[PDB]
Each structure stands twice: as C-alpha cells, then as structure tokens.
Design a protein around this ligand. Structure first.
Ligand SMILES: COc1ccccc1CO/N=C/c1ccc(C(=O)O)cc1
Ligand SMILES: COc1ccccc1CO/N=C\c1ccc(C(=O)O)cc1
Lengths: 116, 117
C-alpha cells in the first residue's frame, strides 16, 4: 500500500470518519485526471487507494472533502476542501501517508514518507 | 488593501516567509479557475493589495502559495508543490479575510481569520 490517508478531527478529538477523499494525477495536458477515491474508515484512515504498479512518479493531488464533513456536524466551515499536491519520487521511501488534522477554519497536513 | 490578505511564516527558521509567490483564482461560470490576482510576500511575510472590496465579489476562490520554490531557494527539497486554500467568499455579504500559512518542508498549516467590517 504505497499511499494512505489519515484524517483527524481537532474539534472532537477523534478520527474524521466517513470523509470523502479523491486522488487525482496530473495529465500531460495539465488537467487533473481521477486516480482513486474512497471514504475514511472508523479509524479515520483510507487504505487500498492504489498499487505499487500504478503509483508511478508524477504529480498527484489528494482532495479531502472537509466542507461536507463539517456540514454533517452542524459546524460552519471555511474551506471547500483540503488539497494536498505533491510529486511522487522513486528515489525516496516507498510508503506515503498523507495525514490531515481538521478544524472548521484551519487544517494542517503532513507527509510521512517511510520504508518498511 | 484589506479585503484579502495573505501571511506566510517559516516554521524552520522562525521567521516570515519572504518573497513567496501567491496566485489567487476565482471559479468562473464554466467551472474553470480564472486568474484573479497575484503577488509576492513582503519582508514581513505579508501580501496586501491583492484586490478591492468592489472587485472581490461573491465566489469560490483559490489561494495558491508557491511553497515548493520557496524551499528550493533555501536548499530544501520539500514534499508539497504548493499550499492551496479554497473557500467561498462574501456569501453573506462582504468580509475581510486573512489567509495565514505556516510552512515546513513536509507539512503546512493554514487558518483563516474572517472579520465583518
Ligand atoms: C498534531 O498532529 C497532527 C497534525 C497534523 C496532521 C496530523 C497530525 C497527527 O497525526 N496523527 C497520527 C495518528 C495516527 C494514529 C492514531 C491513533 O492510533 O489513534 C492517532 C494519530
Ligand atoms: C501556530 O500559528 C499559526 C498556525 C498556522 C498559520 C499561521 C500561524 C501563526 O500566525 N498567526 C499569527 C501571527 C501573526 C504575526 C506574526 C509575526 O509576524 O510576528 C506571527 C504569527
């Protein structure tokens, strides 16, 4: 599993459950092509997005649909979504975890890039 | 100018992030991202004067902060291409917006401070 997404809720102190996540890969004409998607689990995680074979070097965007998460909770949000855009690089470690910490008017994201 | 301000900080050096390029886009009727304004952060890490209250109408706006180029100029190969901030503005009338971003090579944070003039 070369790409995992983990989402936490800074208001409730919990995993962010049932958050839609869409991954795109940038195409040669500079548009964003759909690549993978899912909803976070009860642990706030989304696994199984891609395989080592398909996750080749390139520019990827992970959109986390934060507005619909906050709206379901009755909390006014600022952002439409959180976007995380990065280049995948074969010279580095083999596993990418995109972690995001969500608040109604703020988010933080970090990448944890590791080698099993 | 006051309707839209961007402030960028460097969490490695404990300093403003100076000379950072910022591009603002606005979603058009055809759902594409139309250029709206751009600039660079000052020596205080701040970018003022991007727009006016008249020009900054209701819409969906995207503030791209070109963090990758900032880090490369300091010798660091960072994770992210940019920090993007996408939001609906002025849906309940004009507001002032400060978009603050705190940068590290493999992480960023962003917060919005929204005031009613
Ligand atoms: C301040 O932390 C930030 C800031 C920005 C983005 C992410 C984080 C935290 O990442 N969390 C990781 C994590 C993993 C498992 C559990 C668990 O076992 O419940 C809890 C937490
Ligand atoms: C933990 O703080 C975060 C987290 C995310 C994004 C921004 C910040 C800080 O910016 N906020 C306020 C601020 C204002 C002026 C200065 C100054 O130039 O002295 C420094 C800080």
């Amino acid at each position: 599993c070369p790409l995992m997404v983990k989402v936490l809720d800074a208001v409730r102190g919990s995993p962010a459950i049932n958050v839609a996540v869409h991954v795109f890969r940038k195409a040669a004409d500079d548009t964003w092509e759909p690549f993978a998607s899912g909803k976070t689990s009860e642990s706030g995680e989304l696994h199984g997005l891609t395989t080592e074979e398909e996750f080749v070097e390139g520019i990827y965007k992970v959109e986390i649909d934060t507005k619909s998460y906050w709206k379901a909770l009755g909390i006014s949000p600022f952002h439409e979504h959180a976007e995380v855009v990065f280049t995948a690089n074969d010279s580095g470690p083999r596993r990418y975890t995109i972690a995001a910490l969500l608040s109604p008017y703020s988010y933080s994201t970090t990448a944890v890039v590791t080698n099993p």
